[PDB]
Amino acid sequence: PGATLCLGHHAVPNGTLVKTITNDQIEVTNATELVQSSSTGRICDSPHRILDGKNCTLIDALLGDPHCDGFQNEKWDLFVERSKAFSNCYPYDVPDYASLRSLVASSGTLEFINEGFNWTGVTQSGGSYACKRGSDNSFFSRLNWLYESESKYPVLNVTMPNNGNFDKLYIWGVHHPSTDKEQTNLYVRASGRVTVSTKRSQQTIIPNIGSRPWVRGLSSRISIYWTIVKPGDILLINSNGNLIAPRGYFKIRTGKSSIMRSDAPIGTCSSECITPNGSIPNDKPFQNVNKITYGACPKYVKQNTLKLATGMRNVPE
Amino acid sequence: PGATLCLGHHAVPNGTLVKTITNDQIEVTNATELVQSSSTGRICDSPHRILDGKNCTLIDALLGDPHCDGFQNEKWDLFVERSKAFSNCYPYDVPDYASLRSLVASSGTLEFINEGFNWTGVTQSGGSYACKRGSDNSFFSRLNWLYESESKYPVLNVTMPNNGNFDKLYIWGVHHPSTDKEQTNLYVRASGRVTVSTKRSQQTIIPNIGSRPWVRGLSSRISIYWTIVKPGDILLINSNGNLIAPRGYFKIRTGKSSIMRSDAPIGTCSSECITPNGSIPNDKPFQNVNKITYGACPKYVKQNTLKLATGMRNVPE
Amino acid sequence: PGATLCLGHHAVPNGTLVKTITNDQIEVTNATELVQSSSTGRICDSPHRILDGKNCTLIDALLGDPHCDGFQNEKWDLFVERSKAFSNCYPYDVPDYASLRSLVASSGTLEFINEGFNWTGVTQSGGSYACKRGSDNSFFSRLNWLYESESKYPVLNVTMPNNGNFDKLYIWGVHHPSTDKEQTNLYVRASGRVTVSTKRSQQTIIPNIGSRPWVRGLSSRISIYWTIVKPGDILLINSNGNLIAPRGYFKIRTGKSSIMRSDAPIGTCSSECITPNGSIPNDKPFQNVNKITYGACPKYVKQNTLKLATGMRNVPE
Amino acid sequence: GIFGAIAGFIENGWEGMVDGWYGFRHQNSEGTGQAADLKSTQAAIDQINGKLNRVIEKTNEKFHQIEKEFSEVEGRIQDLEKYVEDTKIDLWSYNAELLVALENQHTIDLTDSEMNKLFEKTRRQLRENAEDMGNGCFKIYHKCDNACIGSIRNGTYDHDVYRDEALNNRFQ
Amino acid sequence: GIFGAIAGFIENGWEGMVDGWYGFRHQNSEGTGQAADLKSTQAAIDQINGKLNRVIEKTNEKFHQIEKEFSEVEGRIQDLEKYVEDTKIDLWSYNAELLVALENQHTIDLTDSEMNKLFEKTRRQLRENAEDMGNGCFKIYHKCDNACIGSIRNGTYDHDVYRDEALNNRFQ
Amino acid sequence: GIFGAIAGFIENGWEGMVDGWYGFRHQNSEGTGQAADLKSTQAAIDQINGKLNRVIEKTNEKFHQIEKEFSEVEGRIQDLEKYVEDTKIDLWSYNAELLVALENQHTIDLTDSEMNKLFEKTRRQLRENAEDMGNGCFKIYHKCDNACIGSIRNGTYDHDVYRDEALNNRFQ
Ligand SMILES: *[C@@H]1O[C@H](CO)[C@@H](O[C@@H]2O[C@H](CO)[C@@H](O[C@@H]3O[C@H](CO[C@H]4O[C@H](CO)[C@@H](O)[C@H](O)[C@@H]4O)[C@@H](O)[C@H](O[C@H]4O[C@H](CO)[C@@H](O)[C@H](O)[C@@H]4O)[C@@H]3O)[C@H](O)[C@H]2NC(C)=O)[C@H](O)[C@H]1NC(C)=O
Ligand SMILES: *[C@@H]1O[C@H](CO)[C@@H](O[C@@H]2O[C@H](CO)[C@@H](O[C@@H]3O[C@H](CO[C@H]4O[C@H](CO)[C@@H](O)[C@H](O)[C@@H]4O)[C@@H](O)[C@H](O[C@H]4O[C@H](CO)[C@@H](O)[C@H](O)[C@@H]4O)[C@@H]3O)[C@H](O)[C@H]2NC(C)=O)[C@H](O)[C@H]1NC(C)=O
Ligand SMILES: *[C@@H]1O[C@H](CO)[C@@H](O[C@@H]2O[C@H](CO)[C@@H](O[C@@H]3O[C@H](CO[C@H]4O[C@H](CO)[C@@H](O)[C@H](O)[C@@H]4O)[C@@H](O)[C@H](O[C@H]4O[C@H](CO)[C@@H](O)[C@H](O)[C@@H]4O)[C@@H]3O)[C@H](O)[C@H]2NC(C)=O)[C@H](O)[C@H]1NC(C)=O
Ligand SMILES: CC(=O)N[C@@H]1[C@@H](O)[C@H](O[C@@H]2O[C@H](CO[C@]3(C(=O)O)C[C@H](O)[C@@H](NC(C)=O)[C@H]([C@H](O)[C@H](O)CO)O3)[C@H](O)[C@H](O)[C@H]2O)[C@@H](CO)O[C@H]1O
Ligand SMILES: CC(=O)N[C@@H]1[C@@H](O)[C@H](O[C@@H]2O[C@H](CO[C@]3(C(=O)O)C[C@H](O)[C@@H](NC(C)=O)[C@H]([C@H](O)[C@H](O)CO)O3)[C@H](O)[C@H](O)[C@H]2O)[C@@H](CO)O[C@H]1O
Ligand SMILES: CC(=O)N[C@@H]1[C@@H](O)[C@H](O[C@@H]2O[C@H](CO[C@]3(C(=O)O)C[C@H](O)[C@@H](NC(C)=O)[C@H]([C@H](O)[C@H](O)CO)O3)[C@H](O)[C@H](O)[C@H]2O)[C@@H](CO)O[C@H]1O
Ligand SMILES: *[C@@H]1O[C@H](CO)[C@@H](O[C@@H]2O[C@H](CO)[C@@H](O[C@@H]3O[C@H](CO)[C@@H](O)[C@H](O)[C@@H]3O)[C@H](O)[C@H]2NC(C)=O)[C@H](O)[C@H]1NC(C)=O
Ligand SMILES: *[C@@H]1O[C@H](CO)[C@@H](O[C@@H]2O[C@H](CO)[C@@H](O[C@@H]3O[C@H](CO)[C@@H](O)[C@H](O)[C@@H]3O)[C@H](O)[C@H]2NC(C)=O)[C@H](O)[C@H]1NC(C)=O
Ligand SMILES: *[C@@H]1O[C@H](CO)[C@@H](O[C@@H]2O[C@H](CO)[C@@H](O[C@@H]3O[C@H](CO)[C@@H](O)[C@H](O)[C@@H]3O)[C@H](O)[C@H]2NC(C)=O)[C@H](O)[C@H]1NC(C)=O
Ligand SMILES: *[C@@H]1O[C@H](CO)[C@@H](O[C@@H]2O[C@H](CO)[C@@H](O)[C@H](O)[C@H]2NC(C)=O)[C@H](O)[C@H]1NC(C)=O
Ligand SMILES: *[C@@H]1O[C@H](CO)[C@@H](O[C@@H]2O[C@H](CO)[C@@H](O)[C@H](O)[C@H]2NC(C)=O)[C@H](O)[C@H]1NC(C)=O
Ligand SMILES: *[C@@H]1O[C@H](CO)[C@@H](O)[C@H](O)[C@H]1NC(C)=O
Ligand SMILES: *[C@@H]1O[C@H](CO)[C@@H](O)[C@H](O)[C@H]1NC(C)=O
Ligand SMILES: *[C@@H]1O[C@H](CO)[C@@H](O)[C@H](O)[C@H]1NC(C)=O
Ligand SMILES: *[C@@H]1O[C@H](CO)[C@@H](O)[C@H](O)[C@H]1NC(C)=O
Ligand SMILES: *[C@@H]1O[C@H](CO)[C@@H](O)[C@H](O)[C@H]1NC(C)=O
Ligand SMILES: *[C@@H]1O[C@H](CO)[C@@H](O)[C@H](O)[C@H]1NC(C)=O
């Protein structure tokens, strides 16, 4: 004359192993994955403004390499550099390439404003067959190759004040001829000098004559440099030869823009987190896809799986 | 015929919400704040030795800009640079300004020992109206502007051994004239050269003639450099023009000194932790006032509040 | 008519104090040490390949300082630099010494392949009494001191393509004579120039004539530089004087090699973890021996002891 | 495991309980039955969903950073860029590993706790009318039909109604 | 919450208990009363003060560091300086958030534990002379005046003195 | 400490128990005795060895890194190298300090738990034949010789054999 009442808990036939403080592997009824380990392989074109660089690196679009003319005045949240990109203008180098690429990438714009520099006494718009634009010998669109006029090259001494309320980025250069005949033919003097200064800073570059390895038709080179001018400051360009002059300035902005090396295709979808492998969801706190990321992303970790228990210990019969 | 005995716990009418592993907001009877989020706005002048730079940056006090003469041979735990500081001597630049500022700041002293360099054949103590000291044209107090004597400038080749038991910091410079007439008038030769070497290191700087933007009366510049000489090593200064010579050395020390950019006023109080906003108490483990700090400080975190429960769950009736 | 049954737990007469969340010091029956704080003082010669530099720094073995001839073509997992090391060849400097030391150390090999550069028109294998090899004046074994032949020094313009499938490291240099007579005697021209370029990069160094402090017999110097050439790229060396030419290239590898400053002796034992104090066991998760380590090592922490409880609270009677 | 109910004095779980995490099985004069306890089930689920919501709380948003892959050997600065990133990754990997270990240890203990709490709540209801058989079951010393069992499951069991009958059966 | 006393089988706290964290309320032949238990109160306070002292243990002292604000665009080196600091701040912010969550979870559980321990200590004193009513109260089956209640509160209650009277009332 | 057994209602440990962590002492008609309980002992040891194996799990292997000691003053880049390393060391030192504090708090609580579990298991075996004296001891109200005590220690005690004798002694 009585009853039995038993207390108890559920179980499942298919439990899942998790780690604890005390156990490398203990079975619970359910768990959820905390490490994002897959990607669709596509960079979603929303919500960030993606600019596909295609055949152009950011620096070649900045300087104005002819096949990069379509990038004039472009904007981006994320500039995507493709591994197939190539230069096809005058062979060049950028001392501290990495820094110029970074500061332009972070600025997020190639917005360019022409300025009327006073180049009285020299010929402008030098060109080369290494840098063709359609049918004609040409040059970087944002740079101005100066050379002798009527067999003279006077000491250039020109100024450009920043009377606005925002910063100006100036890209300029120095020409390295391959022989002494080139040097005297272009600049009369046996050696040049380029000095670009502000109230507070100065850069002097002395060109170097000599052969470099043949690239796109030429053994000569140009070297690229940059100068930022704040409001109330003044740019002063002083040269007696080999100057590759700016045509104006780039507007510098601050904000959330950046640049990524990736060959992933761009698709029509929305994703906050971008990796070079493609966009990834961000519902999990960690990810093992790529330490390189952009946007609202899970944190990169070495583990490819981390199971968070969402149920009790599984004790079957 | 009996009694009732009830066990229980207290509660308060005014509980406080805290976060737990499982609950974003749960009410406990009391809690204490772990993030320091306020400042009095004053930098306490104890226990650290505060040196208010006032109108002077550290580098201008180092070089000896006339309105910074009061900083000669000063010491500090924390040098405070004010945003109103200004240079008022010969316009100049320091390649790697940031590093020289850092190593002097960390050394914590401007202690300067004159040395008798042998400048036979040149005139000493060149001056400029850009750098007035009272009524007279003058120059940086710790630098020695050398120039022609009787229309010659011989190859200077002078030495200064470190026979002591501590390191010597030498500050020196190079003069950039604005025109060729200046160059020949001051140094005879059409171009100068400054080489400063030790047994193990060397620096050569070639000056550059040309106009820079007008600053404090001048389109010319000087460029500042530095050389450390260890015990048993020797300084050798070699120049055929444009040398801005040191007058001696700065004693380099190691220790706890540093430098801070701040406009906060200095007050009579004691505080171990200094931020640019002012001193803050350090009884809490974290702070959200400023990532820039000096002394025994809480750790900077992004959160502006973190409540540590100091009581049980609050269960009112 | 009954019994008593008491439940209980053990204790020990010699408990050990540990820290908890709530207690700075509470006694448990046993604990184990988690911070490795001692070393035998010997670097175990297994399982990593240890190369004792002895009297030679890595850079002096790279360049080929005569007393370092035994290091030609050596390999290592860990190169150990001794504090007694010394240079005994031509006095020199390396701009960015730290980086060249690092990239060679990480490469882990001094494997050197001679290449037949075309030095027609100059004399080769200049020597100096500062760099004796046995009875004869000599020079760095991997460098080639070029100078005038029959009182001329033509514009050198030589090339070396990388037609293989691996990277080439070239070490080269520039000679700084101490006087104008040296300059003209060795290179005819009043000043030299060294330009080393690839398709994508270039370096030009202008030598500087003048006295430096006497070192090993000389007031002149040489300056060391380096250039990496990838497969399909080409090295081009262009100079009109003061060139210190490479004799070939070093094979660059990637892998686990590195370099350590230590005076600890090398012993016959096996240890995965190496510190400058000597090898340490790696059975504990943390260590307080040295923040400098190599291999499979515990993590460095500031604490010199951390006791993990391995037993219950100790409650004696 | 720290209370000793789940995987302890309760021998195993019930795969046939599909409508709750915790509950009751009974045998009486009218047969046998099973019923889920929703309050204890919901208490454990609420806690687990709370910890899940915290772990996924907010995604750091980062924009321009440092470079992390390099095509050229450079030395010092590249060594430091690589070391900074490797340092960061190792610390976040440590945080992730520890977080999951601590959370999973706590989840196993809290679910064990909720099982124990339901058992203790039932024991207290039954007063002197039942005895703990040691395996999660109570032997109820009086006739307890389906409504009576139901009264225990919904917290309205009146122990005074049955005490006389239960005491008589318990003590011979 | 993990023992189920506070916010569990004890329905609510006592705002009128101002001289302790835990304690006793009684009803007997002489009236009603309330008294704080100092030992349990002090045990919970000591633990909380221990964890508070650990959290505030030692202030790192730092002197010359790196720059963290910049007036000029510079590129690579400034990117790395900013990234290093942002990395550090995010990890310390994580440590601070986790520390408070873990500590607060533990503080709620330890204070629940101390309440349960006092209840279990009282139950054990009473032996066969009282029954647990399920809400934190014991029904004491014998006359228990103020001194008797006091004896229970200070651990000197002698259950043998009252056992005969209590057994008689309990079992009809 | 969180269950209140070790350093709680069990007054102290037994230095003379050398063959186990937990166990039984008895007094009966044939004398007194002590015996270790291996299952509870092993359960606590297994858990501690599990946490020990996790703490020593894997050694990071690092090869070429950054420099950490410097013979020359350099400024900006050296400041950053030093700051990166000091930042890393402080965070690992924090992880190590927290890890040991959490683990040691948990080890003390789990060993307390295993003691409580053995006590509760024994209580449940004894049913109505014994009473909890409040200090970790049961008063067993029937003749219980060495084999009987042994039956309790190995989980085969049959409470029905002694219930009549025990009830008679318990209730006058
Ligand atoms: C310092 O030393 C360097 C190295 O010796 C010299 O540099 C070389 O200069 C010559 C110019 O005289 C360069 O020659 C040119 O090579 C180009 C590359 O050709 C490649 O591709 C073709 C297939 O398309 C292959 O067959 C070939 O082997 C190469 O792999 C050619 O495109 C050029 O040819 C065109 O112009 C010439 C006219 O000169 C025609 O005859 C051709 O038919 C064609 O129209 C040209 O031959 C050579 O590439 C340079 N080498 C390097 C490594 O840069 C410097 O000149 C020297 N400095 C001084 C001052 O002497
Ligand atoms: C390369 O090109 C640059 C740019 O054109 C030249 O640099 C200029 O050089 C002239 C000197 O000939 C500088 O002129 C000086 O400007 C000073 C700044 O004046 C400012 O403030 C006043 C109010 O106080 C304003 O009205 C004015 O507009 C400016 O905003 C003046 O202080 C100077 O004036 C004093 O001296 C002159 C005598 O020359 C008197 O007439 C005046 O009354 C007063 O006493 C002076 O006028 C000019 O500032 C420079 N510009 C820049 C940008 O640097 C280089 O000279 C040139 N190089 C070569 C080799 O030709
Ligand atoms: C620019 O200015 C610098 C500094 O004045 C000059 O550099 C000096 O040049 C002279 C050469 O004329 C160097 O003199 C040499 O010093 C060597 C170092 O000797 C040290 O060790 C000995 C003990 O062994 C001590 O007694 C001595 O005091 C030193 O501490 C000696 O080894 C040399 O001596 C040998 O050669 C000479 C022949 O010249 C013999 O007489 C000796 O017996 C011995 O065989 C020699 O005396 C001097 O060291 C340089 N100093 C520095 C700091 O570099 C530059 O020459 C000058 N430039 C120009 C263009 O003038
Ligand atoms: C200026 C000119 O027309 N010179 C003739 C050359 O064609 C020739 O040398 C040949 O030069 C080829 C490259 O020539 C250009 C180029 O890069 O396209 C021609 C450009 O108009 C010129 N631009 C300017 C502003 O001067 C440019 C410039 O001088 C260099 O790029 C500077 O480094 O050079 C190519 O290299 C051929 O291989 C080469 O033979 C010379 C002598 O042969 O004759 C000139 O009439
Ligand atoms: C040396 C001198 O007296 N020269 C006369 C100049 O006054 C004048 O050019 C004027 O120069 C002005 C600046 O002059 C100084 C200065 O900076 O104060 C005068 C200093 O004594 C001199 N110091 C030395 C050691 O030579 C200094 C120096 O040459 C430069 O700073 C080097 O860059 O120059 C100011 O620039 C006026 O605007 C300018 O007209 C010339 C020609 O006018 O006459 C000289 O008699
Ligand atoms: C070339 C030569 O034999 N010159 C004679 C010198 O002995 C002497 O100047 C003396 O030079 C000494 C150092 O001489 C060497 C050296 O460094 O050993 C001699 C080397 O053969 C030479 N190598 C080459 C390829 O030319 C080397 C070279 O010129 C320099 O190292 C370049 O900086 O110099 C030492 O310095 C003595 O102190 C010095 O007197 C001169 C004039 O005295 O006579 C020459 O016959
Ligand atoms: C996302 O993309 C990254 C970057 O491309 C992928 O990581 C890369 O994975 C490849 C695997 O093919 C690694 O290369 C291989 O390494 C092995 C040795 O581990 C070697 O035997 C092969 O010959 C090859 O070189 C590569 O190192 C690695 N890169 C980095 C920077 O870690 C990743 O797999 C992609 N993830 C997803 C989910 O798509
Ligand atoms: C301590 O001082 C720091 C540094 O000055 C203070 O942080 C700064 O707070 C200001 C708020 O006025 C931030 O500037 C503002 O930003 C907003 C957008 O967030 C913008 O709309 C405003 O026009 C203005 O630019 C500034 O970014 C921030 N600086 C840093 C480095 O974080 C801080 O508030 C002070 N704290 C205390 C307790 O005094
Ligand atoms: C492993 O080797 C390291 C590096 O040599 C040792 O650390 C060094 O310990 C010495 C102790 O003699 C420290 O120097 C001394 O500092 C005190 C002040 O703290 C000063 O009064 C002395 O005159 C002397 O300068 C040195 O700073 C320290 N180096 C570093 C980088 O921390 C360490 O002790 C060795 N550990 C073992 C287990 O062998
Ligand atoms: C509850 O917490 C509050 C705030 O954390 C405590 O108030 C502090 O009390 C101390 C000691 O009297 C004062 O020195 C502080 O200035 C107070 N801080 C604040 C922010 O008011 C309070 O003492 C704690 N205890 C109780 C029982 O309320
Ligand atoms: C208690 O801890 C100590 C030290 O942590 C243990 O002693 C170690 O014992 C092992 C196995 O016998 C030896 O290999 C080690 O060399 C010992 N270490 C030290 C520092 O002595 C001990 O075994 C632990 N257990 C007991 C029961 O004491
Ligand atoms: C431009 O430069 C020339 C030469 O120095 C000068 O004559 C002229 O006035 C300057 N300005 C303009 C607007 O041409
Ligand atoms: C200083 O230099 C001159 C010129 O070189 C020289 O004659 C003189 O001896 C040197 N020493 C002293 C003390 O003047
Ligand atoms: C080497 O250089 C000389 C001079 O430029 C040249 O005549 C010769 O052909 C080149 N090649 C060889 C193999 O000598
Ligand atoms: C509880 O169950 C009894 C018996 O089934 C039922 O009569 C009563 O309505 C229920 N009450 C509540 C509050 O669930
Ligand atoms: C305990 O309380 C009783 C009754 O009030 C009192 O007589 C006795 O002295 C107290 N003893 C202790 C140890 O507190
Ligand atoms: C338990 O102990 C009893 C009494 O000593 C013994 O007879 C029996 O064999 C034991 N059984 C088990 C399963 O240990």
GROMACS .gro file of C-alpha atoms in nm, chain D residues 32-153:
model
  122
  983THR     CA    1   0.335   0.417  -1.394
  984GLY     CA    2   0.402   0.757  -1.541
  985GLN     CA    3   0.655   1.019  -1.640
  986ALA     CA    4   0.622   1.396  -1.633
  987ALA     CA    5   0.867   1.677  -1.705
  988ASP     CA    6   0.923   1.951  -1.447
  989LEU     CA    7   0.915   2.278  -1.641
  990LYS     CA    8   1.040   2.518  -1.371
  991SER     CA    9   1.368   2.332  -1.310
  992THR     CA   10   1.410   2.270  -1.684
  993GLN     CA   11   1.356   2.640  -1.755
  994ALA     CA   12   1.591   2.749  -1.473
  995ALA     CA   13   1.881   2.555  -1.624
  996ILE     CA   14   1.799   2.668  -1.979
  997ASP     CA   15   1.778   3.034  -1.873
  998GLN     CA   16   2.122   3.012  -1.713
  999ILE     CA   17   2.280   2.843  -2.015
 1000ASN     CA   18   2.121   3.098  -2.250
 1001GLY     CA   19   2.255   3.373  -2.026
 1002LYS     CA   20   2.611   3.244  -2.050
 1003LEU     CA   21   2.571   3.191  -2.426
 1004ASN     CA   22   2.451   3.549  -2.471
 1005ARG     CA   23   2.750   3.678  -2.275
 1006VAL     CA   24   3.003   3.474  -2.473
 1007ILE     CA   25   2.868   3.614  -2.802
 1008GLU     CA   26   2.798   3.964  -2.655
 1009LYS     CA   27   2.989   4.205  -2.876
 1010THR     CA   28   3.210   4.173  -3.181
 1011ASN     CA   29   3.518   4.394  -3.174
 1012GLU     CA   30   3.523   4.605  -3.487
 1013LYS     CA   31   3.871   4.672  -3.628
 1014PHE     CA   32   3.960   4.861  -3.944
 1015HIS     CA   33   4.312   4.955  -4.059
 1016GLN     CA   34   4.567   4.750  -3.864
 1017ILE     CA   35   4.923   4.627  -3.933
 1018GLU     CA   36   5.042   4.400  -4.211
 1019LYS     CA   37   5.065   4.033  -4.118
 1020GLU     CA   38   5.210   3.860  -4.426
 1021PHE     CA   39   5.525   3.971  -4.608
 1022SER     CA   40   5.682   3.894  -4.945
 1023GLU     CA   41   6.030   4.033  -4.873
 1024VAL     CA   42   6.286   3.971  -4.600
 1025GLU     CA   43   6.341   4.293  -4.404
 1026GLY     CA   44   6.474   4.218  -4.054
 1027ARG     CA   45   6.408   4.421  -3.738
 1028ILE     CA   46   6.076   4.595  -3.805
 1029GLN     CA   47   5.924   4.289  -3.970
 1030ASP     CA   48   6.044   4.074  -3.677
 1031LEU     CA   49   5.856   4.305  -3.441
 1032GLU     CA   50   5.536   4.315  -3.652
 1033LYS     CA   51   5.533   3.933  -3.661
 1034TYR     CA   52   5.610   3.902  -3.288
 1035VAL     CA   53   5.331   4.145  -3.192
 1036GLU     CA   54   5.074   3.947  -3.389
 1037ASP     CA   55   5.196   3.608  -3.269
 1038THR     CA   56   5.190   3.739  -2.912
 1039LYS     CA   57   4.831   3.860  -2.956
 1040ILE     CA   58   4.708   3.536  -3.114
 1041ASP     CA   59   4.861   3.320  -2.839
 1042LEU     CA   60   4.692   3.526  -2.568
 1043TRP     CA   61   4.351   3.521  -2.736
 1044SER     CA   62   4.387   3.148  -2.796
 1045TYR     CA   63   4.461   3.111  -2.423
 1046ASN     CA   64   4.153   3.320  -2.334
 1047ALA     CA   65   3.932   3.108  -2.563
 1048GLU     CA   66   4.062   2.776  -2.428
 1049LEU     CA   67   4.020   2.885  -2.063
 1050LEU     CA   68   3.678   3.040  -2.122
 1051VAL     CA   69   3.533   2.718  -2.267
 1052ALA     CA   70   3.692   2.502  -1.993
 1053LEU     CA   71   3.554   2.722  -1.712
 1054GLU     CA   72   3.212   2.762  -1.872
 1055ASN     CA   73   3.177   2.387  -1.937
 1056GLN     CA   74   3.283   2.297  -1.583
 1057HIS     CA   75   3.025   2.548  -1.455
 1058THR     CA   76   2.747   2.428  -1.689
 1059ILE     CA   77   2.793   2.067  -1.572
 1060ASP     CA   78   2.784   2.180  -1.208
 1061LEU     CA   79   2.481   2.412  -1.247
 1062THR     CA   80   2.275   2.142  -1.420
 1063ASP     CA   81   2.371   1.894  -1.145
 1064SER     CA   82   2.265   2.162  -0.895
 1065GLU     CA   83   1.920   2.207  -1.053
 1066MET     CA   84   1.865   1.831  -1.034
 1067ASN     CA   85   1.960   1.830  -0.668
 1068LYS     CA   86   1.735   2.130  -0.599
 1069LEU     CA   87   1.430   1.953  -0.744
 1070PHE     CA   88   1.507   1.643  -0.538
 1071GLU     CA   89   1.543   1.849  -0.220
 1072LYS     CA   90   1.222   2.038  -0.296
 1073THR     CA   91   1.035   1.708  -0.335
 1074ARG     CA   92   1.185   1.560  -0.017
 1075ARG     CA   93   1.073   1.865   0.180
 1076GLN     CA   94   0.717   1.839   0.045
 1077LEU     CA   95   0.686   1.478   0.155
 1078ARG     CA   96   0.781   1.546   0.521
 1079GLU     CA   97   0.732   1.227   0.723
 1080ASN     CA   98   0.532   1.044   0.455
 1081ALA     CA   99   0.822   0.907   0.245
 1082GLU     CA  100   1.179   0.784   0.273
 1083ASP     CA  101   1.474   0.843   0.038
 1084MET     CA  102   1.572   0.512  -0.120
 1085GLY     CA  103   1.921   0.641  -0.214
 1086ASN     CA  104   1.887   0.632  -0.594
 1087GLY     CA  105   1.679   0.946  -0.652
 1088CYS     CA  106   1.353   0.767  -0.562
 1089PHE     CA  107   1.118   0.819  -0.269
 1090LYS     CA  108   0.922   0.531  -0.125
 1091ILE     CA  109   0.584   0.685  -0.041
 1092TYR     CA  110   0.422   0.499   0.252
 1093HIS     CA  111   0.058   0.566   0.168
 1094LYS     CA  112  -0.186   0.520  -0.116
 1095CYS     CA  113  -0.098   0.792  -0.366
 1096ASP     CA  114  -0.310   0.777  -0.682
 1097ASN     CA  115  -0.259   0.987  -0.995
 1098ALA     CA  116  -0.408   1.309  -0.851
 1099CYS     CA  117  -0.194   1.268  -0.538
 1100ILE     CA  118   0.122   1.222  -0.749
 1101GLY     CA  119   0.007   1.524  -0.950
 1102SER     CA  120  -0.025   1.726  -0.630
 1103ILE     CA  121   0.340   1.648  -0.551
 1104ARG     CA  122   0.452   1.751  -0.899
   0.00000   0.00000   0.00000
